Amino acid sequence: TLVPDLTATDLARHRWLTDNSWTRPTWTVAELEAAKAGRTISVVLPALNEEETVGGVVETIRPLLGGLVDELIVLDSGSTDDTEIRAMAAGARVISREVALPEVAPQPGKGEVLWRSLAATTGDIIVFIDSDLIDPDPMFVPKLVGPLLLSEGVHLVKGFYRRPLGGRVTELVARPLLAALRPELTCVLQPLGGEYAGTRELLMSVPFAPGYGVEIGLLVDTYDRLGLDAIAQVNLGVRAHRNRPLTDLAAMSRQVIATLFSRCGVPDSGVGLTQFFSPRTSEVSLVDRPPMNTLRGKLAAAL
Amino acid sequence: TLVPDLTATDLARHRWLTDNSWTRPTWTVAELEAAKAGRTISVVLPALNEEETVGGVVETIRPLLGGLVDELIVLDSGSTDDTEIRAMAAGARVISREVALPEVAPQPGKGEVLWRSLAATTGDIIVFIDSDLIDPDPMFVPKLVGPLLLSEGVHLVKGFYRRPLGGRVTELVARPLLAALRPELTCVLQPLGGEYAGTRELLMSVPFAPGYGVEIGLLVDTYDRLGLDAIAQVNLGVRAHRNRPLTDLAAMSRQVIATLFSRCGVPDSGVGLTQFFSPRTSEVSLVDRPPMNTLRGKLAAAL
Ligand SMILES: OC[C@H]1O[C@@H](O)[C@H](O)[C@@H](O)[C@@H]1O
Ligand SMILES: OC[C@H]1O[C@@H](O)[C@H](O)[C@@H](O)[C@@H]1O
Ligand SMILES: [Cl-]
Ligand SMILES: [Cl-]
Ligand SMILES: [Cl-]
Ligand SMILES: [Cl-]
Ligand SMILES: [Cl-]
Ligand SMILES: [Cl-]
Ligand SMILES: [Cl-]
Ligand SMILES: [Cl-]
16 A cells, blocks of 8 residues: 655665675574574475576585485476486485375466475475576575574575676566565565575465465565564575576566565456567466465375 | 456457557558548657757658648757757757746656646647657658547557567566556557557546656556547557666656556555665656646636
């Protein structure tokens, strides 16, 4: 709704940008493992036909397994290339969507994959890392769990990259719509980012938007449920932005809008996006997977 | 709201794409002047510091003055370069915002300029043409007034350019939000386009969004008031897309969203867009100029 007591200048100076945003994280793996205090950490890589990059991402994280990281899983979304064998050969456990939750038939999309990994993992903390990253740095996982292990009351950590010496959906769609609908969340540098960590308590109890909606849906549901102070962001390093075609970005934008409208009380038409020059159509989903807590008691493998 | 009776495939095949969309207009200036039937035509060029291009745009239209076109005006928005003298030297009449409507102090933005030109022009038909166009073709005005003069019941004509052998705000923001909020309007190729014509009756009776909202606001208000059949589009030729910086586009996108939310019953926060890396803020307007018919009777120069 209408928030005339908040201005763009207020946001640019917001205290949250100081206490909850680490622009130069300096934690070490030893002291983070020290602060685990009995909490376990699961790392999850969603993967659909990522044979060229998945091993390289797994390798940057594998030295943490058995120490800081307790579980390192690639959640395979029906890949037909060599994603699975290469992930296993890089030291990761690979789980299909069917094995993660066999009672429910798989739907397409990233959100489905991450939702199912809630049922396949056991960590009190779950880190998500895209498996298409070309230049993954081995400090990703430690910088994402920093605030969850040390700071009090953080439940979601979004990892951002500073741009070198620009994601267009993020800059033109996600952040401006957040300015209009959830203005405090414009403090989050990269709301659509694929690198983030969250507590199991939180993630088990919110729905999962399907497809490309999942990241922004999780951000907005966390904010609505727990306030801005429950969210943090950390600099993961200097990744430069990878190229995608505008037609991909247009359909992705449509789903980002539907997922945001869904959480912000805005009635979405449900009509997919047509593109011309001729016609090219795409589809949008308006139904989330319900909170995974909903399925408790009724699974062969317990939660 | 929710429109489950309409699909993206329905839109890609919509009859409107046939009867109201001219992909190869063939009208001639002589037969269009023939069909004027006593209606006059005003052409308006909004202009803020456009000294390099304004004359070139005026010249492509000046041969029509006294024939098809009855008025050729550049509405100067406070330019400090040589926009005014160069427009006059190219054969156009130049009118400041103050001279167009002296009772009301000028607000910044394109929408303000076009709204004020309603009070400075007299044509039953008004054509708007951006004054920053690098390669303007002299068939622009004739192709825009085609449907208004010949076809029945058209009241708004949007001119589109086919891309050579892509506006990012149009493709990622305006068209996807229209898919969610006014799905029929995704049939319009370039909703944000600066080249369009409309009947005086229509334009006098709708508000004018300020700033970068004006084009999409006029499209949506026309659609709501008169239905899709009152709108047409025509191919103006092969213009390639000109470059703008993403930071411009981000603020422009924010205002497009606010203008669309305003017309579609969506409560906009009114908070401007902040951008980081640090902070850079911009502002958004939530107040339109009311329909110009509102001011009738109360102006020194009559309407
Ligand atoms: O699903 C949303 C999309 O956001 C993008 O910025 C990232 O590349 C991915 O996390 C994903 O493809
Ligand atoms: O105001 C909206 C903007 O739309 C853009 O596509 C055009 O270049 C102009 O008509 C304007 O700058
Ligand atoms: Cl099912
Ligand atoms: Cl599937
Ligand atoms: Cl992006
Ligand atoms: Cl919680
Ligand atoms: Cl005033
Ligand atoms: Cl001004
Ligand atoms: Cl554009
Ligand atoms: Cl009318």
